[PDB]
């Protein structure tokens, strides 16, 4: 079974992701190189202002729900499945990285998603479903660009 | 359940909001204290929210071939939503609003049981919106209320 | 010679049938039927938008006037010459008893005006103007709406 | 225990259902005729509009979990419940038409969201729910046009 | 072969019409009763909308090409095809006699169309065929508004 | 005064501000000058805002029962507003509104106390309101035509 | 009774109280101090906003009766009930003098509104009418903030 | 020529038009490769004019006593369109639309000549309109087709 | 008779005419002097704006119909009709000069929309017709300020 | 005597000279007469709209470095070099007056310039050339008006 | 060791102070309550959004000089003087602590300022004014708050 | 030879400059051709209102100063750095050019700053850094896009 508590730390395991992805998303918007700059300068913004808001929206639900967000950024990266950027990426090599690590999140919002039904936390679920809705729609879109 | 029992879920928060856009509106006219640029625009914020609620819950009672509630004498009637009392602070007001919302939350944690076990995922889906929001005016209140 | 206490007995009047005007075009804005349903429905939503913006209006001049608003559903219904729907209305039945209301509100309102003026709040005064005229103006077109022909 | 493939196939026939929908609307907005021309021929745009915000949303749903949409006009007329409007439709027979379909597609909808949900996918079971609640509602409002009296 | 003052004459055939149809369609606007009021009441309105346009932007164009656009009602009055309203009008005469007068302007612009290319002004001829695709297109709802059935 | 009264008063004014918007038009297409860009734009707003007064007015008379005006030669029959004459230099266009101007406000200020003593505060209103946009502009004029 | 010059009188009495009310509203927008800053830092500056709005309105309401509207902040002083700021006001201090302010100036104003109806200049009487609506409706906000 | 033979000229845009939008989602929804962002964003807002087109003309159709044709089966069996096969690069994709848009632009002329010979002066410039815009997407498609 | 290359000399001609008023309509802009500057100052903009469209709007067309759009100054300064400002206009004298380019414009496109038609270039006769739509209504208004 | 303190003094001379000026350009906007009338009218309100937003930007700055900025007219009255309208001006002896305060203004800003970059006050001397900039413009146009 | 290598040294540590920030500010937004919860749980999302404004400006402005822009978490809590928030503050410490980043970053701008202009970086210069300009006028409205 | 005029002289550089890459980028704009077509054109044309922008603010500041503005396509062609069009260029070689011109246009600029800071017009400084500011930000890009 899973409680209130469970889903509490399935919502910070994605504020974790969406911090560190946020700072990810800066860096390869700023070191994107190649004929396809203008395009991807600009997605790699779109998504980080995406990922702002998920931030925002997980952590004041944990608020709902008398819970800690996770505050600080060595809390972040501690939890994070989401790594932090290496050096020397080609466009190619960044979109591939943000692809897989969309993939590992869909994967975590499909188990974070079945935790917080199984606990009633129906708000959570819905704001899980969400994500999921986006990251999938994403990630299609970096595989059609990666075909 | 059934669909019937999923309409008495929808009226029960027709009423509640409907009276509650009165008393919002009470709060709104009647606050004092140093917050009261704040909260005068929170409380309207909050009613024109509430008459939203009204008109969407209403409106899928007639989707699935009910009957809203539309009379404000069957609305006091439902609701478990009081009307507002005379003299309040603006910390009381802020406080009945907390209790509100976390007896609306309450009920609409069954009205999702209720909707979802008829079948009714339209309904359960605008009940969860419903208590998304609720449940995030709740933890504002009690940020406001806390003792610094 | 009316005095501001008489104003305000005024002002309430208004809170209270538009707050249950408020409430009853809802009612109309979900059953209403008929041939005529999507202008209609638009039309009552349009219309009790207005309305509570005329209660917020009067409710906070009476408190710029140092008075009471009347702040319940309870207080509303027993002051409110706007009586509750009742059932079974057809789109021109609900058309005609507005249309009776609106007349029956420009009526109290030619006596709030006067009541306002001679009591020296002109403010109120042309709050009420200001309402008689969206009244007077929906109620020919209810009147053209209902028209036989 | 139904699987990703199962929602796949719900999903495309909603794309079908909604590109022959889509083009059925466009004819009902070009032929309709009457007293609720204005109203009918505004209304069937935004439907038509609804309907293509349907196709791609689905369409590209099916694209996220690795699925084929039906990307052509025959394929769709053949999946779709939705038939091609006929010759000499009156406004209330077009009206009573559409609201046929929406109640057929509310009711796949229903099978379609429980599928989705035993399948896992709960991000199309969503999207369905949503499409299920705009079919729902203007479906009422299909049918409170069409009410005697 | 027609010359620019044929031009001239063409065009302030229309700047007359539609400055005594702007009035006329004010009239409709006011006078609309019935069941179709709410739709009929603001379509006038953005008919008069449109005639204003194109009265200006005729009138202009005559100022382009050095002549003297009719600036006074009485002698629009006078060389308008488009007659003032008279009295008791249903909607449905309104729609009918606005029908015939934008048949009656659409055959008046065909012919104004073959006389501004004969006489190589072809931007007053663009500005005919603009005026004749708005015109042609709203007979097309009037006449579907008044389709029996 | 009646309410009669004030619907002739109402009507005058729908006749005024009709014959008013063609002049305007007129005036707006006709003007010439080292002024041409600023008074071809001024006296477009001024039929612009001609064209709201004439519906609002009216249908204030179908408000109270009446009959508005609907012909344009029931208005050159009953406005005080002359059509423009052939031949204007700028300076006599706005002189010749300035005149209409300071006329009509004239008129007002006695459809005002008709209004008023006949107990239809709403014209009353809606005479006010032109009035004072009809004196402000009629200062805008006579500002226009000071001698520099 | 009362002529076109009474009126003239009592509207330049206002452009006068809000010129000098413009400069207490900005002097309160910068000197506000105390938990509520952010609040009636915003609440002085529409305010102000609002007294410019009506300096203008009465001014070419002069304009257009044939009067001279007070066009020097030295006439301004002279006339005007409202006092420029002393030093050292808290935000208390501040609601308080300005409710007193708005209630002077609405007493003024039914004065006036009295003076321009038996003028036969409605158009003026309009005007106070509407200041004076704005002027209950905020001096009602500034006693609940007290109260 | 008469006003049914541009009446059929008329149709046979509406039924092209019809299948290039269904045509334009396909290849919105499939297009892949590094050009990815930039195609799938263009599609849409070609399939976006051509809904335009289709309900503009169509209307044409109404306006001159016409029956457009609404079904997609007869849009099947007018349109010089073809629906999208199974599988394109992207380079495939803006070649078919390049051959479509040129294809389309010849019968345009055609639609324009006949339109003006019949005396219906509104269709011609609805066609001139699209021809205008097809002719300039065109370029586009050649322009990114051109090899580097 | 007419053809395409005919209807794309035409084009080019326009696309010179308007480059070189571009940058007149600038200098006009910029040197414009007398109680009429604001007014003209403004106007001179909104004509180089228009301008700016007009130049883009035929070059593209050209390019539609597989032509060459004249794309260098000194390629344009040897075509256009419309010559560089001289040194001391007076307001009056650059609307006068103006007026006489606009003039000699719309006479350019008489003819221009004569060969498009003929040479069945129904869309670049369009775009000559829109542009002397525009070309004739602001000579009007030039004349209407001179007069 | 500090630095600091002849920078406020710089800010303050600024808040004097804009907050008169606000009031005669509001002069200016209601008597302004003649031909020009419409356009002088309008000007005139967008330069003490301009005027406003310098009187709030400096006085807050003045806050943010420590100081106390003017809040009183009778102390701008004092300092300001902007003096306040004379009775019955021609637009054209309006535009003259204009030019002339803009042409003290912008030299006083040039020497406020330096002294807030002498001071390392690179914030106060960026606002003090953002206004400059703004006024030089602004004289040039009142300069052209004028011939 | 040269001076546009300093300039992109005092690029880095702002890049990394705000990365910071942007978390604490995001931290001080959620746990913020009291009776200012409304008025402080709104300013401190408005004062992130510039946060990720200033990131994204100054990291590409190291770009646009050939450098590297911090890019990582790991690397910011390094450089940062800004620190990650601790357990539990009132709103009214939360306050004084962004006081005193505030203060502390304005100090360090002063002399990002000075090593950017010797540099001949002016660019980079007038983007530390900027931020140098709302950073101090925000310390000052914290300060008001504070009393 | 006074210090204004040579800063005048920057000026007009710039004028001429840019005047001529408005037309060389509205080359660019029509011609470019390749997979990345539907960026660069909109890039282009994105650079060119850049153009138009600097070519105005320029232009009416040497106004403002007491200069003359170049307004001639021949004056402009003379004193330019940036030249037209040659025939043919590939994507790429569009963008390689762009860049060279941008990094001749940015060191200009550097001297041009100096120049305007040493004879005290800050306000043509601050314009000259603004342009240099958006210059080395799209060099950047065009850098990364070439790789």
């Known amino acids: 079974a899973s409680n209130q508590q469970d889903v509490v730390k399935e ?73 932090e950027a290496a050096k020397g990426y080609s466009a190619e090599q960044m979109v591939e990285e943000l692809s897989q690590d969309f993939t590992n999140i869909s994967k975590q919002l499909e188990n974070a998603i079945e935790i917080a039904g199984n606990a009633g936390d129906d708000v959570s679920e819905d704001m899980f479903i969400g994500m999921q809705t986006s990251v999938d729609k994403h990630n299609w879109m970096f595989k059609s660009y990666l075909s």
Chains 1, 7, 9, 10, 11, 12 share one sequence.
């Open 11 to 83: 919502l910070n395991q994605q504020v974790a992701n969406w911090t560190v992805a946020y700072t990810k998303l800066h860096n390869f918007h700023w070191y994107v190189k190649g004929p396809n700059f203008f395009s991807l300068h600009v997605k790699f913004e779109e998504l980080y202002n995406e990922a702002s808001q998920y931030v925002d929206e997980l952590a004041e639900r944990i608020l709902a729900v008398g819970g800690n967000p996770v505050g600080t950024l060595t809390e972040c990266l501690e939890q994070s499945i989401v790594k």
